[PDB]
Amino acid sequence: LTANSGTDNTMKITVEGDTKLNDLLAYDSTTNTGNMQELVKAENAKLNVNGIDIERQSNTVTDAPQGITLTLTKKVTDATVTVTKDDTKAKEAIKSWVDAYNSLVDT
Amino acid sequence: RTIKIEQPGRKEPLEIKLDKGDTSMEAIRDAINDADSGIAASIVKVKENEFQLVLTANSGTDNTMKITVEGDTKLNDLLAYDSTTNTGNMQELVKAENAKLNVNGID
Amino acid sequence: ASSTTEDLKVSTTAGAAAGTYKINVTQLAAAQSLATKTTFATTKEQLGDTSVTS
Amino acid sequence: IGITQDGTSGKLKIDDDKLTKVLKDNTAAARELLVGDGKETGITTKIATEVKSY
Numbered sequence: 001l002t003a004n005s006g007t008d009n010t011m012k013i014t015v016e017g018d019t020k021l022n023d024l025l026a027y028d029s030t031t032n033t034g035n036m037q038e039l040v041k042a043e044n045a046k047l048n049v050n051g052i053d054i055e056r057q058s059n060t061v062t063d064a065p066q067g068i069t070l071t072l073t074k075k076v077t078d079a080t081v082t083v084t085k086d087d088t089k090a091k092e093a094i095k096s097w098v099d100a101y102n103s104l105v106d107t
Numbered sequence: 108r109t110i111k112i113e114q115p116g117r118k119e120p121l122e123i124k125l126d127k128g129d130t131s132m133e134a135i136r137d138a139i140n141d142a143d144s145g146i147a148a149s150i151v152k153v154k155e156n157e158f159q160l161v162l163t164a165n166s167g168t169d170n171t172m173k174i175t176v177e178g179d180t181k182l183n184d185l186l187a188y189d190s191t192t193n194t195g196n197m198q199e200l201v202k203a204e205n206a207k208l209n210v211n212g213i214d
Numbered sequence: 215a216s217s218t219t220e221d222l223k224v225s226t227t228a229g230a231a232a233g234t235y236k237i238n239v240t241q242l243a244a245a246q247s248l249a250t251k252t253t254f255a256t257t258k259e260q261l262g263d264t265s266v267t268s
Numbered sequence: 269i270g271i272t273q274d275g276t277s278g279k280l281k282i283d284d285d286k287l288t289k290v291l292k293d294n295t296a297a298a299r300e301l302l303v304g305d306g307k308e309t310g311i312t313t314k315i316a317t318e319v320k321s322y
Contacts, residue, residue, distance in 0.1 A: 001248045001249065002247050018266060020261065020263070021262060024250070024252065025250075036249060038248070038249060039247045039249045045241065047240060048240055049151070049153055049237060051198070051201075054153070058154075061152065061155050064159075066230065067150065067231075068150050068152070068224050068225070069227070070222065070223075071224075071225070072222045073222070075239060076237075078237075079219040079237050080218060080219075080235070081217040081218070081235055081236075082215065082218070083215040083230070085295075087292060091291060094269075094271075094287065095282070105278035106279070140295075141296040142296075143296065147231065149235050150230060
């Protein structure tokens with residue numbers, strides 16, 4: 001029973017009334033002890049940036065980065081990413097823009 | 108805003124003439140881009156709900172960064188920083204360090 | 215821009231600046247999972263009774 | 269930038285190397301040249317307004 005991931009989104013599921021599901025769904029994830037077995041216990045993401053360690057849970061973050069999305073499949077060590085400015089897309093856009101004028105003059 | 112950034116490497120100091128009504132953070136980035144300033148803002152992700160600033164054009168004792176403010180209500184105290192002291196309000200990823208290699212049997 | 219490492223990838227959208235940065239990850243991201251104890255010998259029988267309307 | 273019209277006609281005899289070297293020199297000049305403020309100033313805004321009038 002996995003709606004999403006994260007300790008921030010705590011999921012509390014109950015049953016108002018059911019023939020068999022009433023007892024089945026009674027459990028509290030906060031206590032971490034109950035009738036239902038656990039496959040993966042509550043674990044949080046861990047990293048070290050700015051010389052500071054962070055244990056906060058959230059995996060994907062896009063607010064602070066402000067223009068980069070990080071996709072991870074395996075563990076990495078001290079990965080260095082160098083960002084380089086691209087200007088060829090402006091070049092092609094300018095070339096299409098000048099072409100529009102050349103076509104207009106030809107017409 | 109009055110910010111003067113100087114290094115021994117470049118003879119001409121860097122100074123900006125940001126005008127009234129253009130004091131937003133993105134406005135500051137646009138002004139930096141328009142000025143073609145050597146100082147660059149790199150993407151540093153800590154976590155959500157945190158705002159951060161970086162000001163690193165280069166590194167090394169030859170290129171020391173002297174940052175001053177003529178007069179500002181808030182920025183004069185914010186921009187006070189000395190690289191030589193190695194202790195201040197200005198956080199760092201790694202201490203003052205440069206590239207290191209070995210050629211011709213010499214480091 | 216693109217990253218040198220292949221295990222982890224980055225995707226840059228417009229409006230971002232250019233600059234190098236080194237990142238370290240100590241523990242791989244872990245997703246919380248909750249399992250339900252529905253151990254019944256035969257699940258072919260109707261889980262809910264027909265008396266309950268919903 | 270290097271956008272040059274033809275000697276006898278309106279075709280833009282664009283100088284590819286000149287345009288390329290200028291845009292690698294600085295894109296900010298291009299940003300501030302024709303876009304301007306982006307709200308009302310700019311070639312696109314007036315062209316669109318006059319076409320909507322037409």
